[PDB]
Amino acid sequence: MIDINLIREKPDYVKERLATRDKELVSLVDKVLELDKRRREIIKRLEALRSERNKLSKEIGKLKREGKDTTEIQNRVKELKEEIDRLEEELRKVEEELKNTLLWIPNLPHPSVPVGEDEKDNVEVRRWGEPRKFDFEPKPHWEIGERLGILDFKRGAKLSGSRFTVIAGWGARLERALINFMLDLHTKKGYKEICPPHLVKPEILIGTGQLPKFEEDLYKCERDNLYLIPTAEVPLTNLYREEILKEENLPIYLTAYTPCYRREAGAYGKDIRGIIRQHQFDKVELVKIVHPDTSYDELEKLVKDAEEVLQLLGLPYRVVELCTGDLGFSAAKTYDIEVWFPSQNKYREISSCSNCEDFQARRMNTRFKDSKTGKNRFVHTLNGSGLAVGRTLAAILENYQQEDGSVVVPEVLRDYVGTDVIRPE
Amino acid sequence: MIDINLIREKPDYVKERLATRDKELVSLVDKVLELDKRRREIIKRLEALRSERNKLSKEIGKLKREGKDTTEIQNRVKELKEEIDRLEEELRKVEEELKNTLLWIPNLPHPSVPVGEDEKDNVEVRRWGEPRKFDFEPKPHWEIGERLGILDFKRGAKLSGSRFTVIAGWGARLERALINFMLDLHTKKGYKEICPPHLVKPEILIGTGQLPKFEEDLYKCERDNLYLIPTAEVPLTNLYREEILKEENLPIYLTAYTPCYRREAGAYGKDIRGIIRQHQFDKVELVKIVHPDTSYDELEKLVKDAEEVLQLLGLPYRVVELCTGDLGFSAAKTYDIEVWFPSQNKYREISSCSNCEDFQARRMNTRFKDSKTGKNRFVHTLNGSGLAVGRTLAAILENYQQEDGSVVVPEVLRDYVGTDVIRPE
Ligand SMILES: Nc1ncnc2c1ncn2[C@@H]1O[C@H](COS(=O)(=O)NC(=O)[C@@H](N)CO)[C@@H](O)[C@H]1O
Ligand SMILES: Nc1ncnc2c1ncn2[C@@H]1O[C@H](COS(=O)(=O)NC(=O)[C@@H](N)CO)[C@@H](O)[C@H]1O
Numbered sequence: 056m057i058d059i060n061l062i063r064e065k066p067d068y069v070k071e072r073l074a075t076r077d078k079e080l081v082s083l084v085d086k087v088l089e090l091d092k093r094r095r096e097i098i099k100r101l102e103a104l105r106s107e108r109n110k111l112s113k114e115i116g117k118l119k120r121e122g123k124d125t126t127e128i129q130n131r132v133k134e135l136k137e138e139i140d141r142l143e144e145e146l147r148k149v150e151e152e153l154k155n156t157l158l159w160i161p162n163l164p165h166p167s168v169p170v171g172e173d174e175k176d177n178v179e180v181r182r183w184g185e186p187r188k189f190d191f192e193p194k195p196h197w198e199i200g201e202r203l204g205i206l207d208f209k210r211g212a213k214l215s216g217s218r219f220t221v222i223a224g225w226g227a228r229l230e231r232a233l234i235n236f237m238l239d240l241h242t243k244k245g246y247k248e249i250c251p252p253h254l255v256k257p258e259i260l261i262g263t264g265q266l267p268k269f270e271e272d273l274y275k276c277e278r279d280n281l282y283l284i285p286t287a288e289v290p291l292t293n294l295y296r297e298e299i300l301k302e303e304n305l306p307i308y309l310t311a312y313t314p315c316y317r318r319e320a321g322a323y324g325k326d327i328r329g330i331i332r333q334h335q336f337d338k339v340e341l342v343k344i345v346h347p348d349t350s351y352d353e354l355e356k357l358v359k360d361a362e363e364v365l366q367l368l369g370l371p372y373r374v375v376e377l378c379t380g381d382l383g384f385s386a387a388k389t390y391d392i393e394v395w396f397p398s399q400n401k402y403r404e405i406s407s408c409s410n411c412e413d414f415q416a417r418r419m420n421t422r423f424k425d426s427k428t429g430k431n432r433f434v435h436t437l438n439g440s441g442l443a444v445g446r447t448l449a450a451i452l453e454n455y456q457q458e459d460g461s462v463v464v465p466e467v468l469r470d471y472v473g474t475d476v477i478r479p480e
Numbered sequence: 481m482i483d484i485n486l487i488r489e490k491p492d493y494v495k496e497r498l499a500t501r502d503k504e505l506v507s508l509v510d511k512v513l514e515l516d517k518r519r520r521e522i523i524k525r526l527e528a529l530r531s532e533r534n535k536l537s538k539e540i541g542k543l544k545r546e547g548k549d550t551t552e553i554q555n556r557v558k559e560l561k562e563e564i565d566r567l568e569e570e571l572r573k574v575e576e577e578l579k580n581t582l583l584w585i586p587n588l589p590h591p592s593v594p595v596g597e598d599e600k601d602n603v604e605v606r607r608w609g610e611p612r613k614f615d616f617e618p619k620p621h622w623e624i625g626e627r628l629g630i631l632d633f634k635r636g637a638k639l640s641g642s643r644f645t646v647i648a649g650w651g652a653r654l655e656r657a658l659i660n661f662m663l664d665l666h667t668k669k670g671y672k673e674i675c676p677p678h679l680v681k682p683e684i685l686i687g688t689g690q691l692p693k694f695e696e697d698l699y700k701c702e703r704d705n706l707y708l709i710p711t712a713e714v715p716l717t718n719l720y721r722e723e724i725l726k727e728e729n730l731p732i733y734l735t736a737y738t739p740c741y742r743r744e745a746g747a748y749g750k751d752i753r754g755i756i757r758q759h760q761f762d763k764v765e766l767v768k769i770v771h772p773d774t775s776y777d778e779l780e781k782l783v784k785d786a787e788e789v790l791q792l793l794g795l796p797y798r799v800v801e802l803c804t805g806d807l808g809f810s811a812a813k814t815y816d817i818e819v820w821f822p823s824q825n826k827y828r829e830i831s832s833c834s835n836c837e838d839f840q841a842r843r844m845n846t847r848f849k850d851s852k853t854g855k856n857r858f859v860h861t862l863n864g865s866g867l868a869v870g871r872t873l874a875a876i877l878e879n880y881q882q883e884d885g886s887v888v889v890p891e892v893l894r895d896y897v898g899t900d901v902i903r904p905e
Contacts, residue, residue, distance in 0.1 A: 274701045
C-alpha cells in the first residue's frame with residue numbers, strides 16, 4: 056500500500072499516476088479522501104459530545120445537593136451519550152472501510168516508467184542472441200515433448216483436469232537439472248537458498264499485493280484458511296514481517312524454488328496447448344530486501360542476474376520495460392525478460408523483474424533502524440523470475456530441437472542431466 | 481477394493497481377515513451381502529417384468545389387427561411398466577449404497593503378516609549400522625538447526641502456522657542435495673523419474689485409498705474440487721488408471737520428488753518440536769506397477785532399494801514388518817524403515833514400503849492382457865518412501881553433529897552440497 060499522508064498532501068499527483076494505470080483508479084483517491092474526511096469529522100464531533108456530557112454529568116453531580124434539574128438535564132445527557140456510541144460505532148466502521156480501501160490501491164509507478172494503455176506500449180530495452188534459423192519447420196514444445204514421451208498432457212488431465220501436465224523421464228530429469236543449475240548459479244552469486252512453506256496465511260498474500268484484489272486468482276483451502284502460493288515471492292518476501300532490521304544486515308538476497316499454483320481464472324483460450332500457462336509450474340524466484348537508496352540499482356542488477364541464466368543456456372531473448380498500463384499491482388517499475396519460441400515466431404515472457412520500493416514493505420510492516428536518523432524506515436523489496444522453469448524447458452525443447460525429433464541438451468545442463476541429447480525414448 | 485465374488489464365495493475368510501484389522505469391520509461384509517442380495521433379486525424380477533412386458537406389447541400389436549383385448553391387457557402392461565420403473569429407481573439407490581460401502585473396506589492382510597493390535601506388536605526383521613555413542617549429550621535436530629540458522633521455526637509459523645518450518649541456506653542446499661542424491665540413486669536403479677501434479681481430482685485419491693475414509697486428512701481446495709497430494713504415491717500410481725496395459729511393458733518402476741501436504745489432524749501433541757511431523761514435507765517416493773506373480777518379491781526389492789539410501793548415507797537403521805492392527809488402509813503387507821535418532825535415543829519411521837496386491841488397481845481399474853489366458857487381470861501395486869527427505873535431514877543433523885554445533889556433511893552428499901561440514905553460518 057501507499058501512505059495516507061501522501062494522498063492527503065498531494066491528491067493531485069496520486070491521481071495522475073494512478074491514472075497512468077487506469078483512469079478508473081482516480082475514484083479510489085476520492086473515496087479515501089471522503090472516507091478520511093468523515094473519519095476526522097466524527098472525532099471532532101465526538102470530542103464535543105464528550106465535552107458536553109462530561110460538563111453536564113459534572114453539573115448534575117454538584118446539583119445533587121438539592122435541585123430537581125436532574126431530568127431536563129439528565130436527559131440532555133442520556134440523549135447525548137446515546138449518540139456518542141452511535142458515532143463510535145461508525146468511526147470503528149469508517150476506519151475499517153478506510154483501511155481496506157487503501158489496500159486496494161496499486162503502487163504509484165515511478166516517473167521513469169513510460170506511459171501506455173497495454174502490452175503493445177511496452178518499450179524494448181535490449182536483446183541478446185539471434186533466433187535460430189530453421190531449414191525445417193520447427194515443432195511446438197508440446198509436440199516434440201509428447202513424441203519423446205516427456206510431456207504427458209493426457210495423463211495430466213486425467214489426474215487434474217486441464218492446464219496440468221505430467222513431465223516424465225528425461226523430461227523430468229531435465230526439469231530438475233534446470234532447477235539445480237539455476238539455484239547454484241544464484242547462490243554462488245550471493246542469494247540465500249531457502250525452502251518455504253507452500254500454503255500460507257492470508258496476511259502473507261495481503262503483504263505482497265496478491266490479496267485482496269486477486270483472491271479469485273488463488274487456490275484456497277477454505278477449511279484451514281491457508282492459500283497455496285502463486286510464487287516463491289510471497290513466502291520469501293514476508294520472511295521478515297513485522298520486524299525492524301539492522302541496516303548492517305541489508306541488503307538481504309534470497310532465492311528459492313517452489314511449485315507455483317495459479318487458478319489462472321482469466322487466461323481463457325489463451326495458451327491452451329503447451330506448458331506456458333498451467334495451474335502448476337516450477338519457478339526459481341529471486342527476492343531482494345534492500346535499503347531504499349539502492350533499490351533501483353538492485354533492480355538493474357536483478358535483471359542481469361536473470362539474463363545470465365538465459366545466456367549461459369544459449370537461449371536468445373530480449374528485455375522489455377513494462378508501461379504504466381501493464382505494470383502489475385505491487386510494482387513501481389518492472390522489466391520482463393522474453394525468450395524466443397521458434398514454433399510461435401515470437402518472444403514470450405519468461406521472467407518478470409520488478410522493484411516495489413516501499414509498497415510491499417508498508418502492508419507487511421518491514422522497516423529498519425538506519426545508521427543515520429536513528430528512526431525507523433520502511434525497506435524496499437524487489438523480486439524477479441530467476442527463470443520460471445516450465446517455460447525455460449519449453450524454450451529448450453524448441454530452440455534445441457532436431458528434424459528427427461530429438462532435443463540437444465544445452466552444454467551447461469549436461470553435467471546435471473546425464474545425456475548430451477535426448478532422443479525418442 | 482476387493483472383488484465382491486471373493487466376498488460371496490468365501491464370506492467366511494473375508495470376515496476373519498478384516499477381523500485381524502478390527503472386529504468392527506465384520507459388519508461391512510454383512511452389509512455388502514445383504515445389499516448384493518437385494519440387488520440380485522431386483523435384477524431377476526426385473527428381467528421377468530421386462531420379458532412379460534415385451535411379450536404383451538408384442539401381443540397387443542399383432543392384435544391391433546382387429547381385436548378389443550387391448551384394454552385388459554394394455555392395463556396389464558401399464559401396471560407392469562409402472563413397476564419396472566419403481567424397481568430401476570431403487571436398484572439405483574441400492575447400488576450406490578453398495579459401491580460406496582465397498583470403498584470403505586480395507587485390503588485383506590496377507591497371511592504372512594503377524595497378528596497384533598498395536599505398533600508395539602510389530603516385529604523387527606533386521607538392522608544395519610550401530611548407533612554412534614556420544615562423548616557429550618547429543619542435541620536434538622531443531623536445536624542444532626536453529627543454532628545453525630538452517631531451520632526457522634519462528635518464521636515458518638509466522639508464515640503458515642504451526643507444523644510449518646522454513647529451511648534455509650546450508651539447510652536448504654543440503655535438503656536439495658538429499659533429493660538429488662536419492663533420485664539419482666533410484667533412477668540409476670531403473671525407476672522412471674516423473675514430475676506429477678500436486679493438485680489432484682478426487683477419484684485419484686479414491687484410487688489409492690486416501691478417500692473416502694481419510695477425507696479429514698487431506699487439504700481440499702473446495703472451490704475447484706481438487707485435493708493437495710499427501711504423497712507422490714497418489715499421482716504416480718493413478719498414472720495408468722482406467723487402462724489396459726501390455727504385459728510386455730510390466731513391470732513399471734517410477735520415482736518422483738514432491739512436497740507432501742497433510743492436515744495431520746491426528747498428530748496432536750506428538751512430535752511438536754522438530755520437523756518429523758509437518759504439514760509440508762519433502763519425500764522421494766518409489767512406486768511399482770507389477771504383474772501379480774512378482775508382487776511380493778518386488779516388495780522385498782523395494783525395501784532394499786530404500787535401505788540402500790540410508791546405508792550410503794551412513795545412517796544406522798532397523799526394519800520392521802507392521803502387524804495387521806497397524807497395517808494401513810490400502811496395504812496388504814508392509815515394512816517400515818526406522819532411522820536412529822540420538823537425541824531421542826530411539827529409532828523412528830523414515831520409510832514405509834507396502835504391497836497392495838490388486839486393492840488399489842481394482843478401485844482405479846488398471847489391468848493388463850497377459851501372454852497366457854488372453855483375458856484381462858488387475859495389476860498389483862506397491863510403493864514406499866525412497867526416503868522422506870525431511871526426516872532424513874533431521875537424522876543427519878543429529879547423527880553427524882559435533883560439540884561446537886556444526887554438523888558433518890555425509891561423504892556422499894558433499895559433491896552435491898558443497899562443503900564437508902556446515903559450521904555456525
Ligand atoms: N500459469 C503459469 N504457468 C507457467 N508459467 C507461468 C504462469 N504464470 C506465470 N508464469 C511464468 O512465471 C513468471 C513469473 O510470474 S509473474 O507473476 O510474472 N512474476 C512473479 O511471479 C514474480 N514473483 C517474479 O517471479 C512469468 O513471467 C512467466 O514466465
Ligand atoms: N506429517 C509428516 N511430516 C513429515 N514426514 C512425514 C509425515 N507423515 C509421514 N511422514 C514420513 O513419510 C513416510 C511415508 O508416509 S506414510 O504415510 O507412512 N506412507 C506413505 O506415505 C506411502 N504413500 C509411501 O510413501 C513416513 O514413514 C515418514 O517417514
